[PDB]
Design a protein around this ligand. Structure first.
Ligand SMILES: CCCCCCCCCCO[C@@H]1O[C@H](CO)[C@@H](O[C@H]2O[C@H](CO)[C@@H](O)[C@H](O)[C@H]2O)[C@H](O)[C@H]1O
Ligand SMILES: CCCCCCCCCCO[C@@H]1O[C@H](CO)[C@@H](O[C@H]2O[C@H](CO)[C@@H](O)[C@H](O)[C@H]2O)[C@H](O)[C@H]1O
Ligand SMILES: CCCCCCCCCCO[C@@H]1O[C@H](CO)[C@@H](O[C@H]2O[C@H](CO)[C@@H](O)[C@H](O)[C@H]2O)[C@H](O)[C@H]1O
Ligand SMILES: [Br-]
Ligand SMILES: [Br-]
Ligand code: NA
Lengths: 125, 96, 125, 96
């Protein structure tokens, strides 16, 4: 399981760097709910939802690529820690209306990007 | 590594034309169970249907009286390593 | 570019951790996969403590804050895996645990970040 | 490329011993504002205090009547790129 490890690094590296580039360019535009950290979470949610309903239909794919996409890319692309500080900060700044809003959008949006990616591919097929 | 296949597949109540089967759920987030039933002698269309993961019993109906049937049940489950996938089946035979 | 290595080396370790902890442990509690959670609480912890520390030491190299925050924590944590699990449970008609998983991840990760931050804050005093 | 420093700092109301300052908040998430004020004349200890981020006005008291004070303001704010850091200050002079 060293081959297994390169899949995590390659995939995560992409997902991370990807997440890194997007957050710096776009997060500052709307601080009450930074959009960079939201798009990567919606994006991975979209991807993993598609990976869900496609992996299902391909039982004999290499455990290598499945790792590199989900654990690697989506795992490295999405973030939960960076989601927490932004809320913790909106809470220390007494911005409750937005702190609560940021929690809702991330959770639900991520599950809809998952529902979309799943049901788009379930429906194409 | 934990197994994703049900266990203790068995007819708990039969009539001539219906079978009440039940099983025990695997230790995995099972999205739904698939039950397949056909006449043991490979001479009949095999039928399949789904039952929610929250249920561990199904009813097979429309059966012929006095005929041997092969009944099998497998899962469509979520696991960390494989996302969605189908389990290998657990089969039994039963004569109506 | 020097910043690029931080995200990579950081995210790589975090992703490699999220992987190992997720495979070895997730399969023990399907209703709430605990590997996807600890990585989250642990990253939420790290980020909270990182928050309060880099404040007191406001002049340290940006390289180390990057590797630890956007890398380590960003790689260690995950939102896609938290999504699929909840979506998997939602698909399975397991509404009770789908909800619980959502709460424990958020409430918990937030508690962990506050805990990480407030410990450090109380330390420097 | 977004400034964390406040803008348009001015005294909106004054008494012989107290100044009332107002500022425009930066387009960042400010955790708290740090106000600093001291007699503009040399070695009077500069005093400072904080104001929550949701507020953008502050009162300063205990000042001697008819003295020029230096009033400065910066922020402890959150940015994705830096987490909790302190902003550059914005200063004005007002004489009671
Ligand atoms: C359900 C999930 C729970 C997870 C845990 C959440 C923990 C949140 C911690 C927030 O930290 C506090 O927030 C207060 C409120 O923002 C701040 O008050 C500051 O701001 C207030 C409002 O802006 C002022 O009234 C206060 O005097 C001033 O100290 C206070 O400093 C800060 O330490
Ligand atoms: C907070 C919002 C987050 C974003 C939205 C996420 C929505 C995710 C669930 C959608 O998937 C459906 O869920 C149903 C309920 O679990 C399943 O019903 C299945 O299971 C039911 C169990 O009662 C049966 O009654 C149905 O017939 C059977 O199709 C159904 O198959 C499944 O496709
Ligand atoms: C689920 C648990 C939820 C509750 C978590 C705790 C929330 C309440 C915190 C109370 O303690 C606070 O500690 C702050 C210091 O950490 C003080 O901040 C003071 O100093 C800060 C800087 O250290 C400034 O930003 C603040 O505005 C200023 O009020 C503040 O007075 C004090 O009351
Ligand atoms: Br982070
Ligand atoms: Br994932
Ligand atoms: Na991540």
């Amino acid at each position: 399981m060293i081959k297994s490890l390169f899949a995590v690094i390659i995939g995560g590296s992409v997902g991370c760097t990807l997440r890194w580039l997007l957050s710096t360019k776009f997060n500052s535009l709307f601080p009450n709910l930074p959009p960079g950290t939201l798009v990567v979470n919606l994006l991975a949610g979209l991807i993993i939802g598609t990976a869900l309903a496609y992996f299902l239909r391909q039982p004999h794919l290499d455990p290598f690529w499945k790792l590199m996409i989900t654990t690697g890319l989506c795992g490295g692309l999405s973030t939960f820690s960076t989601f927490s500080v932004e809320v913790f900060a909106l809470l220390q700044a007494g911005n409750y209306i937005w702190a609560l809003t940021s929690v809702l959008v991330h959770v639900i949006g991520s599950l809809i990007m998952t529902a979309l990616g799943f049901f788009i591919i379930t429906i194409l097929f | 590594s934990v197994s994703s296949v049900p266990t203790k597949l068995e007819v708990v109540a039969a009539t001539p034309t219906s079978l009440l089967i039940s099983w025990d759920a695997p230790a995995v987030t099972v999205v739904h169970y698939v039950i397949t039933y056909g006449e043991t002698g490979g001479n009949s269309p095999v039928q399949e249907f789904t039952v929610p993961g929250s249920k561990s019993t199904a009813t097979i109906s429309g059966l012929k009286p006095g005929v041997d049937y092969t009944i099998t049940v497998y899962t469509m489950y979520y696991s960390y390593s494989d996302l969605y996938s189908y389990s290998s089946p657990i089969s039994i035979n039963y004569r109506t």
